[model samples]
Target: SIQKIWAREILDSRGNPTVEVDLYTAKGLFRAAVPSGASTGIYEALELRDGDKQRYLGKGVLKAVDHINSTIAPALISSGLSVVEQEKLDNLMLELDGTENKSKFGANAILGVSLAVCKAGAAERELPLYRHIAQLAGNSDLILPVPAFNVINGGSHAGNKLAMQEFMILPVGAESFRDAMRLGAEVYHTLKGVIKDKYGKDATNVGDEGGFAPNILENSEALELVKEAIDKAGYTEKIVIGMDVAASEFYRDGKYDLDFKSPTDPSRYITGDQLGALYQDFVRDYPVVSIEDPFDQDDWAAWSKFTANVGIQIVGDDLTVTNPKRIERAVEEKACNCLLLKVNQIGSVTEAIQACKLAQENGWGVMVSHRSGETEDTFIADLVVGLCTGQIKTGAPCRSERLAKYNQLMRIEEELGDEARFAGHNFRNPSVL
Candidate 1:
């Protein structure tokens, strides 16, 4: 049985206060920290905060820490830890909160302890994090995720002319995750040089996710630039492009008011069907492998039509919000073919895993992902491997916070040795079509 738990407040990569929890068991002490997102979805679980603008600019997490130490620890101390499983512990926390949004005890606090306990359980059994997660997943095999490096940024992630949220590079031809990362890094650097030559040295300025925010006229212009980079790097056939439209940012009044804010480009408004047509044009012109959140969150009819039209991997991010119920709804509606899984979005490891399991069971693709405002914690890396999803979107291969995930995957790949398998073929298999 576990002896003690310590909850403290800490700062994330964005220099904002967040929750950190420590769990002490028979074998060792485990610690975990929660990360935050900037452009959060409307229906996402609540991230508890202290609401003190004077400290950390209204991002303080002291209240979450208090709830963990006072409310959570007391309830957990009563539970039988000797044979406690992950689901039971998570259910206890959910029952204590007794709310849909985790407003009572905060998702950050709940998630922090939830992951820490998993880590402690793995340590007590002398197993690797990925290995333990595989046990939890009822599987012993692990797989490395193909890299989907976001190399360009727009929308809320950066102040740029482009309206799209992210422009990513997918190394579909790489034989291993390490090689995929290498190919992505080469193309990323080539992209930097391309932007510096065309636009200015300042155009290479990185955004929240360490992606270049160039002064492109429109969102499609960014795609063209990345295509040029891939060609220039001599990996045009080996790699393809993916995008996160994050259309919610531009969606309002039943139309997407796309304003490049430039005299030459001009602003344009389009309905959901019109926007899907535009994306179809892009797919015809570029090697677009995946597109996320192309329509508004509530535009289920448009989503279904656009998805069938594109015939590519359409991922649900804002629409599903990493919740099982929301994802189930999407499955029944045929809204998307893939899911962008973010653990913090659900605020519990068990729930996130359950959501992924549901998606996998329904023949939907699972993409373990990261947020722009993240910490150096590499839990998601282990998760992608353990879940055997074979797809990840963690931004460009730059910045320690982003690289931490890529680096952890490299280590896990080496650890797996002969057993390691890359997710390249599964990601875009033509059989799925």
Candidate 2:
């Protein structure tokens, strides 16, 4: 049974205020923090914020904290429900809010408590969080995900002329997760040297996701730089490239402006076919095996056509938003072959699992993700292992917040010993293993 529940405002990796919750049970205190997103989709569940611009530029979550401390804590404590009843408790909160998007009590508030409750449940069951989560999701096998290191940043996350959001390196040939980390770290450092040599030392400055933000304008140049780094690291055969275009940022009146950061230029915008042709060229030249959000969220025709044409994995982040309805629609339309799972986008642990299940059942790959605004909470790290998602993108090897998740995965791999299995080249479809 829960003894008490408390909520507070805490800062995320970007120094923005977010929600943190402390749940007390007979075992002890279970704490969890919520992460926020910068390139959030329009259909994502509402993240309530204070309207008072005087405080943190109106981004403060004090109102959300109050809702948790005042309304949620009392109801949950009085209900006499055990912390182990995850579904019931989560349902209670959903019913309390009584809204489709959880706007009444704020998804952040509910999510903070939901995460804490999950931790408490694991403690009460005398099991690790990942094991508990696996039981909840009805998963019997645990596989380590292939870490997709975002080594370069552009688009909305950076102040550079490049248009792509993230350029990632996936060491799919590594025999183990630890080996994969080493491969990624070596390539990350090599990339820094390559950027410094070609564009000067100042070009190595990091972006919001801890990826280098060089001032390169052409997207292919960024790909070329990564290819050079991989070759220099001497693991060109072991490492592959993945990208998150976040094309919604540049989407305009039925066209895409690759240089959306520049001043408005309607004449320079290109049609969906042109943009798709550019991606085809990238796949033909680079080792790109995956591309995410290649078109606007509502551009179903483009997404379907691209997915039908391309052999690489197509992921939906801004398109699916980790909502079951959107995932179902994408599955029906065959818009994407992968789902970028961000727990905050769906609001609760149970709902997040439901979305993953929906995507998995439809033969779509699932990649658990971290937000641009993150915290030290390693819940998502455990989440990828528990759900057996087989892939994750937390950021580059830099930054403590991003490293925290990677470190936790290594610990988990160590604990599993011989039972541990790295996804390796099976990352695209771990279920086949």
Query: What TM-score fits each model?
Result: 0.96, 0.99
Model 1: residues with Cα > 4 Å off, grouped in runs: 82-84, 260-267, 428-433
- For model 1, residues 1-433, the per-residue Cα lDDT tens digits are 6688899987787788888888888786788888888878888889987888798788888999999999898788789664137788888899999999898988898999888888887787688889888888876667788889999989888877677789999998998988998999999999999999999999999988989989775877898899999999999889999999988777877787566333332246777877888899889999998999998788888898887776799999989989999999999999998999988888898999999888888888988889888887888898888877878998798888899999999999999999888878677322231
Backbone clashes for every candidate come to 0, 0
Residue pairs with backbone overlap in model 2: none
Please give the distance, in angstroms, between residue 377's alpha carbon in candidate 2 and its true position after superposition. 0.9
RMSD vs true structure, all candidates: 2.4, 0.8
Among all candidates shown, the one with the greatest lDDT? 2
lDDT of each: 0.85, 0.94
